Amino acid sequence: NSKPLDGIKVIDFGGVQSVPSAAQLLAWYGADVIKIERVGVGDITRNQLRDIPDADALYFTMLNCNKRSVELNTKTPEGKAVFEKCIKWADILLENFRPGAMERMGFTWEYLQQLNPRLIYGTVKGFGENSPWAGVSAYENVAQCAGGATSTTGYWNGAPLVDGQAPGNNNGPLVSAAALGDSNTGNHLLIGVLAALFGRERTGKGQKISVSMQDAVLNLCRVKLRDQQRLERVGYLEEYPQYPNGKFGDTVPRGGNAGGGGQPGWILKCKGWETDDNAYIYCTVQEQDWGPTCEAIGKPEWATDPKYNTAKARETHMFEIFAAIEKAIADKTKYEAVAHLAKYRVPCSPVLSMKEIAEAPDLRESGTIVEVQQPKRGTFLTINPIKFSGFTPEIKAAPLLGQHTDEVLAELGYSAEEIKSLRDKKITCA
């Protein structure tokens, strides 16, 4: 029924993924969200990798549902004055433009507070204010490289040798498909903004939330910072693939598809792997019930072999064990492999392609993947991750550029003459 953010007013003053994704979530939870975009072209996502020539790209519609679009050139004195009225209207202002942009536009945090002492200002940059990289261009992959994720993702070089490795020392840092830099930073920003919004109820005061992309990536790599400290003290990482047949250095190495503390595991080929990039499962060799594991893979002999039957003894032979499992499932599809290993309660799970995910009926039924009616496009799918017992979001079309400009100006108190004037002066259009 009633939505938690009903009557909360938000300005989405950003682009791409971090800020818009957070603002989209706010709208879905009830917020009145207006997106102020540059004239003529709007948010960069509108025009990036279109699949339908005359329509807004999917990048944009999947990040900007339930918003109203305001076209506005804040780099003009008239535009700035309109923006200042918007700022007074809003509870929340979110921005992620390049370092110094807001400042050159006339909007220091000090000034923003002057305009609206209730304002909760959320700002995202690639790096913290004091970083030696503050001048680096902050793309998704730059944040992943800066925050420890690429360093610690992918394969190691050398022993133990495994099929997925590149030859020699060509196993380098690897980018993650997940938006550690973008959407993830948005999540962190939303945490800060909502904490601030709650605190504002008692104090009546706004404040500034700052999240850097590097820091948000690092937060998701908290366990890698854990491992770094273990490594420095202990000299090795016992659960890593390199122990005991490889070599550790002074920094956390890449670990392939390793399971981690107390739950050793790996991603294994299934029938069809040579032509199907997703004919794979994940399988754990658990530190209990080794007996059933042995039977599942046809190694009943291992249940008693002193070289296997203790959690801490199969610690050293895992890759032989993984190979035995793949041999046991080499004739099975991933779904057949899972069903076979489940017979014995060997914990495992399929690797699911985006096609299988997109088509999954259980994800439609739960409201996690939602089909949305979009003009000039038809329908498209979006993701709604967090479920509330009290209400369900009503997800609606993403706005055309400037579709609501005059409606919002009117809502702000501008007469019909000033509105035509602003559009005449090319403040609200190109």
Ligand X SMILES: CC(C)(COP(=O)(O)OP(=O)(O)OC[C@H]1O[C@@H](n2cnc3c(N)ncnc32)[C@H](O)[C@@H]1OP(=O)(O)O)[C@@H](O)C(=O)NCCC(=O)NCCS
Q: Annotated active-site positions, please?
A: 182
What does 36 bind: a second copy, ligand X, none (CB cut-off 5 to 8 Å by kind)? ligand X
Of the candidate spans 67-75, 149-157, 223-231, 319-327, the one that interacts with ligand X by CB under 6 A turns out to be 67-75
DSSP 235-268: SS-TTSTTTTTS---SSPPP-TT---TT--EEEE
Per this entry, what is the length of the chain?
430
Q: Which of 87, 190, 296, 325 binds a second copy (CB under 8 A)?
A: 190
Q: Which of residues 24-53 bind ligand X (CB under 6 A)?
A: 36-38
Lay out the site mask for a second copy across 66-105 (x = CB under 8 A, - = otherwise): ----------------------------------------
Check the annotation: does 403 bind a ligand.
no
- Total residues in contact with ligand X, by rule CB under 6 A: 27
User: Which of 122, 181, 192, 259 is the binder for ligand X (CB under 6 A)?
Assistant: 181
* Angle formed at CA 262 by CA 258 and CA 267, multiple of 5 degrees: 25
Least distance to a second copy, CB of residue 266, Å:
9
233 annotated to a ligand binding site: no
Would you count residue 265 as binding a second copy (CB under 8 A)? yes
- Evaluated on CA atoms 97, 99, 105, 108, the torsion sign reads positive
Residues 405, 183: Cα–Cα separation, whole Å: 27
Shortest CB 99 distance to ligand X, Å: 7
b (16+ CB within 10 A) / e for 120-140:
bbbbbbbbeeebeeeebebeb
Based on CB atoms, which residue is closest to ligand X, 152 or 184? 184
Q: Which range binds a second copy by CB under 8 A, 54-62, 321-329, 397-405, 422-430? A: 54-62
Instruction: Please name which of 286, 284, 287, 233 lies closest in space to residue 257, comparing C-alpha atoms.
Output: 284
Single-letter amino acid, residue 407:
E
Which runs of consecutive H residues, i.e. helices, occur in 271-311? 290-296
Query: Would the annotation count 74 as a binding residue?
Result: yes
Each residue 332-371 as x (binds a second copy by CB under 8 A) or -, in order, gives ----------x----xxxxxxxxxxxx---xx-xx-xx--
73 binds, among ligand X, a second copy, none (CB under 5 to 8 A by kind): ligand X
Nearer to a second copy, 348 or 408 (CB): 348
CA 353 to chain centre: 18
Helices (H), 132-182: 140-146, 149-152
Burial of 271 (0-12, 13-18, 19+ CB in 10 A): middle
Binding mask 116-145 for ligand X (x = CB under 6 A): --------xxx----------xxxx-----
Query: What does the block give as tokens for 40?
Result: 């003529």
**Which of these, 277, 284, 267, 269, lies nearest to 333 by C-alpha position?**
269
Annotated binding-site positions: 17-18, 38, 72-75, 96, 98, 104, 138, 182, 261-263, 286-288
Binding-site ranges for ligand X (CB under 6 A): 15-18, 36-38, 72-75, 96-98, 101, 104-105, 124-126, 137-140, 181-182, 213
